[PDB]
Write a protein that binds this ligand. Structure first.
Ligand SMILES: [Mg+2]
Ligand SMILES: [Mg+2]
Ligand SMILES: [Mg+2]
Lengths: 464, 463, 461, 464
């Protein structure tokens, strides 16, 4: 039933068919212009951009901007997300998070190793394996340097080869042979690196760009500790991902990649480039994070809502859907309960079920970033920004129904004081916007909710 | 400088010129279909509808649906509000509330009495003055009966004639001669009803429909106690309002009306004595419900303009004020000028929120403000995405909330049954102010993170 | 059993060994105030300071006139005796007596031909405040506080309303004094009427009256209620007054000293000072608990709250301003059957209603916190009260916050809240669930059958 | 410098010397009268009671009631606590918690094994080891049965013998050979019984009554996971505690005990008695928990404040003292900061230091029972109930300066709803009652704070 797109070329051919990708043949400077073009695209809900000619490297390597920004397809703003996750172009916000959460109840599917892949048609070794051959975009005026990895995946394995992590972490260019990035000890990349430091050996790595579109979504997903992204991807699409052996490092990489950067991480934390392999006419996708709406919101926040939905359902909570509204910049989670939630959780009041949701979320990886969690009924679509704001304004008390917890916070969230940020300790709220029992509720006043179907059908016939 | 539209025909001709009104010649049943057509229009941002043919009364009286709903005019969703208030079709949310607040600093302009008006071309008296000859729309399935007044103005004078109140209150049809409605004692209509009840005499009234488009906005405005709407309308437009004498009741009604329902209120039922109308009458309706309708575009908007005027009169550095339409007239956004600290030394962010709360709490409008968000003026409160982003990223999940308990809006949704029954519940003032300009982090977007040459080069490539 | 003057009051305290005479000289400059603080804080007897540096044995000073009593098992005895009750009257019986008088018609006073307070009469230059002690009660004060436990009689220009207020009056020199005339109080309002006519307001300050007067003088009665009428209704008989020698004002015949004068528009001016042989000038040295700020002002404010809450038909068993909370907290105890008496309300609902009723009254601004509790706890028992708040008030919910006018002297406000006169006040819900749904209390009285308790009392008491 | 009382007889001889113990020679019924006599004693601040004749067992076994209740010694209400912890009869609230916290910075002192002890002068085995030989007091109405362990220690060890826990937990009698009690998995006793259960073996146990008076205080103390109570006692007193081998179980028990009950815990959980040993004329102390003031407040709450003081100081916080007020029934912790706290914690505001205190406490075992923590200055004595209430009323804002955290709660605390108790999830607050800087403060108005020393000395001469 899934319609999985197997590489970036298939993804781009589907966006072409829906007139949702534009080619720019005029030269664009990776120094700020490429990043600015990506921001213009996100903010004006423009087509994805194929930057065909870049200052410094010419037409050698293309750049794909806004790979999963909001779509131009009429009535389908989530189309790039839907297609990236093998769903219909018009799949809803609920169908998307439900598909991802459903795969969390399935057994992982191991990948398969292929003899060859287009990502190894061109191989650069030794002094030829130089990043100066590719664009080094300075994405924002104030950045420390060029961010080479914003929509690509870092691949590392434990020394024993028992666990392989695919993660999306920012990587900054130092020079043609060296890059750097953060190895936070609370995430897998850093935990795996510590195992390589204990054995006194450089950690082999590979960074892939322009893989099949579903990979960066799963690489952004806060899966539990023992779950490999490749296995989850396999369970999600219902078939094994095809991997190819890296040329210089005993790692398996997606065969769908446009570019593969291979090397070793040395404490010097520096990534040292040993080889670069790429398919003919390579494409390097970028993601330019900032205010809504970009892949921070359409990918990272969205897959975090799908993980919350899976965790809440695993705790046997009657959750209809979960969503991280794009306008709230991945600061809010909306939890919608089924209409029969009281029958499914018999001893709890509205405050009681909010206490239980808080208790369940508080025990997970993702709790620290939830600055606010709004608990609402499923008569509200949390992906409809007007209906969501209306529900919060009219259903959340101005004083009560707020559960405040203090603890770890997202250091990048905006709603914290300087001392809260410095201590890494601040407030997170769970807000109760649930209504009284369905029979006790006042009828909703709108076209859909206040008129009989024959009257609505007659009006649609006259006006639509 | 204002471009006032003197009646409903001028208003409709301007909407026609901007392709923002659609004529429906097929019959529409006032029983639910008219209300449903109005809701479809609001919710799909459709053109205003001129319901030309209505079952029961045919083509006699027309109905105007979504008279001040969101506009179809590209890039100008507030165009119906702007044109209704004599402004340019493209006037912004700020220009609109600023125009209304500016008129609060001006002296009232007394109206002028004219000898005749089109609203009296046809006069029905005695048994002919029957509301069954006009449409009686059942606007929502669950309503108690037909709501005859939703976008019309009820004119009422004190027994001494020293004060003339123009108000917009709900009026439900009982039969062809009788209507009923709420006379809340905290409003001028319920306060003036207490003066005519004390004298044991019936209160004369006159309800007008389809007046010039600016009247229902001022009728909805919570002006201070001693301020007549007619005087404010005169100060706003910069010229006197032309009134005509009522045929049967000693009240001065707008000469721009389509229909004038004259009568007297018994000690609460409205009893019809006369119905005058101009040729080919138009009866506008407003079908209140979820965003966005005239509850939001008129009532909430004029309440933000009054808050802006009151806050400025208290010498507060308020750049703008707005009642977001998506929040259903439950929230007020107060944006402070960038130099508010220089203008209000030596208050902290919490200090200025305390002062705003203290000022608002002393006014008429405080009870309906379920939440007030105090933000900086780098946020447009009429941009729903930017507003939600500012609240999510700038209001603490726990602190910077001033809670006050007292009178509430009995129709607001965020109250318990006991809070509604007591008429006593919580109202919050939320602090979403940034630290000083120099201390602030740079905003990350196309406009805020790139040099002008880089933005201009990108606009050249992509626009 | 009303005590008609300060000598009757002092004779009753003597009979209960609750007053001590200090014949050794005490300096009005700080020592008298320090002796009063030692007394309050050590729950010592009231002090009769006979010899005072500067004036000697002329005018005596009564310290801790209504401080906590030394009488075993009766700490509220000075309050009880001051209000004509039994020496052992409880916290509840005291506030209930005062609240009961609020349901009664005022009793007009009677004018007598003479009084002991006019046995001596100083006029002109003889009317010098320097003849009497001028105590500097606290190190940091601006000057001597002459009025701390006396009453300021004032009438409107038309003579239709007479206010008996207790306000702080500071000595400037031998003839002039100064004090606060807050416009939200009667003394500031009655003053505005005299300013509108462009005339000085005649006044009269009395010291050492019958002990019940300073309690009613501290009570926040409604706007149209005279203090002398309430006193008359409280005691059930008219208050005997006398015409002031130099001003058109009637003053208590029970006074020790009467200081008559005029208020030029804020300074005061003395005309005459009349007194009875061997005068006594009582003082009140306000500070940390427990003094007359707590035993009189806070207590009478709880009695007024009890009267207002009952007038709103609320099932209030008692009300109290705990002394340890320095007149910052009001405790409202509901009757056990409150749910039957207020049928549609939840615990939160009755707290909303109490808040709504209190918010409409004069006294709301000083209630920094109001705790709504059941009547199974005594709010005058500081241990039981703290236990009830700790175990029954949620650490997060059941708090109704209101913002508005505040007591500018309350401690729990920021500098900006004080400067704006706008800050938070809370109503806390500490009500238990329905009587059947409750857990049994674990203590001697609540966990054991009466035969078992009686057998234990026989063995151990 | 310590003056340790090595058994209950030494403790009782010291209370006799201070006229703080009374003997009852008239028979007292263990069914409710003994418990009622203990409550009368606590509530009237009476002497400790030695009940010499108890209905059913006569003069065989005595009962000591209110072993650490408030003392009758003039000016020394904490004397039973002070003497129990080897301090002077007049040691203050601060000196007591400071002594206990100081021992937390010291190395544990291993105990010593002795050949014999008075607690084994009489040995009952087989059918003779029957609890019906001793009083079985029904302490309260509501109690499911007789509570045999209220002021005694439960001694258990791990199968490997690497860790020995001395615990004070509820033990209710079933019959003459069987008892039951709670084995909370969050405490050591339940964690240790799981290890015996995994080996398919009953857990050996010993319960001791009437040991030296310091033991029940340390058994109530929430020490960290790897710290044995016997080692802490040794470090506290500055000398090894003397133990004797148990007769029928492989455990070491205090040689100072009046009574040893030895046996094995079975899952079907029930304590089964295999031997009872006791010294001549045994004394069985009881603690009758209820409203203030009993050993719940004078021992458990007090040692929890000492542990909080030790943890806060280990986090380098400038804490002058910590205390759990007796009137607040072990629901509140008061944290008093030193006057110079701002100099010692330079970048923090009053709210900032409260956030830091909350963060430190939240990382510890004791967080859950802290329904409220009040952060005050050290110009307030938190053991003075009037001054404490005055400080909270006048210094804590009616709305702000409250940090709320949600999580684990004390299931026995009163201030929780039925749903919060059932979920084990509810609110806990940290309240900011700190004054502004010392120069910015208003002077305190009282005898001590508003008058010069010569004026105070002159007044004391006149009136004292
Ligand atoms: Mg991952
Ligand atoms: Mg008064
Ligand atoms: Mg332990």
């Amino acid at each position: 039933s899934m319609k999985r797109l197997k590489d970036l070329r298939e993804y781009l051919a589907v966006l072409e068919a829906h007139q949702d990708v534009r080619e720019i043949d005029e030269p664009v400077d990776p120094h700020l212009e490429a990043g600015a073009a990506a921001r213009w695209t996100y903010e004006n809900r423009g087509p994805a951009l194929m930057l065909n000619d870049l200052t410094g490297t010419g037409r050698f390597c293309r750049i794909l901007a806004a790979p999963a920004g909001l779509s131009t397809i009429p009535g389908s703003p989530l189309a790039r997300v839907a297609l990236s996750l093998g769903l219909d172009v018009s799949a809803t916000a609920h169908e998307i998070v439900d598909s991802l959460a459903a795969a969390r109840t399935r057994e992982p599917v191991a990948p398969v190793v292929v003899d060859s892949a287009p990502c190894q048609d061109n191989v650069l070794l030794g002094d030829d394996a130089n990043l100066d051959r590719f664009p080094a975009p300075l994405l924002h005026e104030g950045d420390g340097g060029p961010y080479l990895n914003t929509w690509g995946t870092i691949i590392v394995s434990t020394p024993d080869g028992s666990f392989t992590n695919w993660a999306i972490a920012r990587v900054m260019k130092i020079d043609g042979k060296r890059m750097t990035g953060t190895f936070i000890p609370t995430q897998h990349l850093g935990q795996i690196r510590k195992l390589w430091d204990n054995l006194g050996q450089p950690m082999p790595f590979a960074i892939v760009q322009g893989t099949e579109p579903g990979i960066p979504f799963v690489a952004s997903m806060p899966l539990p500790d023992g779950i490999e992204e490749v296995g989850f991807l396999g369970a999600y699409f219902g078939e094994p991902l095809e991997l190819v052996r890296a040329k210089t490092v005993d790692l398996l990489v997606p065969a769908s990649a446009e570019i593969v950067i291979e090397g070793h991480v040395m404490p010097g934390p520096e990534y040292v480039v040993d080889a670069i392999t790429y398919r003919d006419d390579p494409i390097w996708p970028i993601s330019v994070a900032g205010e809504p709406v970009d892949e921070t919101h359409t990918a990272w926040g969205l897959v975090t809502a799908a993980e919350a939905l899976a965790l809440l359902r695993a705790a046997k909570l009657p959750v209809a859907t979960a969503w991280m509204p794009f306008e709230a910049a991945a600061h809010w989670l909306i939890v919608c309960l089924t209409e029969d939630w009281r029958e499914r959780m018999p001893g709890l009041s509205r405050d009681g079920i909010c206490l239980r949701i808080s208790q369940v979320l508080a025990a997970t990886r993702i709790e620290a970033m939830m600055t606010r969690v709004f608990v609402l009924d499923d008569d509200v679509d949390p992906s409809d920004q007007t209906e969501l704001a209306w529900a919060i304004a009219t259903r959340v008390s101005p004083a009560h129904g707020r559960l405040v917890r203090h603890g770890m916070i997202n250091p990048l969230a905006g709603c914290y004081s300087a001392e809260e940020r410095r201590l890494g300790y601040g407030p997170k709220a769970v807000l109760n916007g649930l209504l009284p029992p369905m029979a006790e509720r006042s009828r909703r006043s709108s076209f859909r909710h206040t008129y009989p179907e024959p009257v609505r059908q007659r009006v649609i016939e006259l006006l639509a």
